[PDB]
Amino acid sequence: IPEYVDWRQKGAVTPVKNQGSCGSCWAFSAVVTIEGIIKIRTGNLNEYSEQELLDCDRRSYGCNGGYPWSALQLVAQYGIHYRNTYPYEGVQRYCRSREKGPYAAKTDGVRQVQPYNEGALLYSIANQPVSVVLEAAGKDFQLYRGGIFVGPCGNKVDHAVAAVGYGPNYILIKNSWGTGWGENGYIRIKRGTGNSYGVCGLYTSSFYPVKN
Template sequence: MATAALVLLLAVAPAPAIAMDFSDKDLASEDSLWALYESWRAEHTVSRNLGEKASRFDVFKKNVRLIHEFNLGDEPYKLRLNRFGDMTADEFSRVYASSRAFHGDRRSDSFMHGSAPAASSLPSSVDWRKKGAVTGVKDQGQCGSCWAFSTVAAIEGINAIRTKKLISLSEQQLVDCTASNWGCSGGWMDTAFQYIATGCGIASEAAYPYTAQQAPTCNTCVRRLVKIDGYQDVPANNETALQVAVAAQPVSVVVDASGFQFYSEGVFAGECGTSTNHAVTAVGYGTTVDGTQYWILKNSWGLGWGEKGYIRIKRNVEDNRGLCGIAQVASYPVKTSPNTKQDVHDEL
């Protein structure tokens, strides 16, 4: 069996909440910072015991000042106080970006979108959100299932492209049923694609809703909705090949997300490595007015993070692995077969 990105994410985000703004006035004194911390805790429903609260407040203060000072600079992206506000950078990395991506043996099948045509032959920009092929941003909750969200977003995309119907599909089915993966402890997107292609298909979100925990049993072949015929891997370490694939459909990718803690807007060009640890979905690409090329990535940390749940990261960097390792391991589902009449009935 082919293997690709093994994404092992530990615990994940709490209930979604909106990022908070603050001003110089909030930083003026210890009392004003305490008031800001209390407001942040209330906004994000964070409870702390008395012993932990003081140490967490110290972390919060450092993070608030880091965000403030960073935003005074001229970087092409901005930071914002979000639900990760009283976590240290090391804690964030361990919890949200501590997994290892297992590259494994890549499939030898030919790349159906072409090997590496000239970038000049591709559209200058693509945004599958504007083409009706991307569902709303979701939140994986307290389950290490980023791999399932990446898989599902890619399948939602190709299904919308092929059928002209955008349907939210079930991450929970993959968490419960993909035997070769580890549920809330991680998994391979390619293995999930293979499970859907060789099995009964994948159910809608409504038919098999998300619970953010792995069930002891799998709801086998119950109300399956969408079918795919397989998957293909994008040639590794080739951003042009990845661009070719994303021009055709949303694509599952893995990145090093250790630097994403307080990302808010703009094109991320900050420090990150290539030891990929988090699965997301590339849903487009483009270029800013000043000529900076970027990827559009759909994340699964809810609407309160990033650009309403998305991040743009710099594209076509000197390292052929891509910024944050985005070009190392990417794959996408193949769909040529129609969904059955029974499947369509189950959608209703």
């Protein structure tokens, strides 16, 4: 895999989103990875529905949190609608997939990266955007404006985001806090520190969709 990856440069990343007050980061993270894998496999960059996963992932808890792996499973076993067909409302509602016509895209499964393994995570990013988790509760993370973030932060992961690239000393993260947070909505988190958890627990739980 190469020294630099940045899926934005390869037209595989949609604009930065804002999850709002809703604890729907798990759905935003999954959707980032679906938009990426659909671009990689088909050549078209589309936006898909975080709200659909929020409403319909019966293993997640709506705005009280959820599981990126479960949302990616949901997209692999049914499919997902375009974001515009099923726009984000920032509140959990009744599942409306059946009422929104045929699904726009469908994947074939979801694989997990080996946890606590930086190279394994980098390997997946070189193939596609990956759903990752991290500790976002620290004010240092909350107030991040730019640069390669090294913390302070613990390994208490609580926030799902998406890794869309990396470099020799960082992993590139698409967050769901709007375009005004971080580096136009992104954070570069230091890698290569030798901490197996990853900086901010970044290596705790990583999933990506599979689409043949």
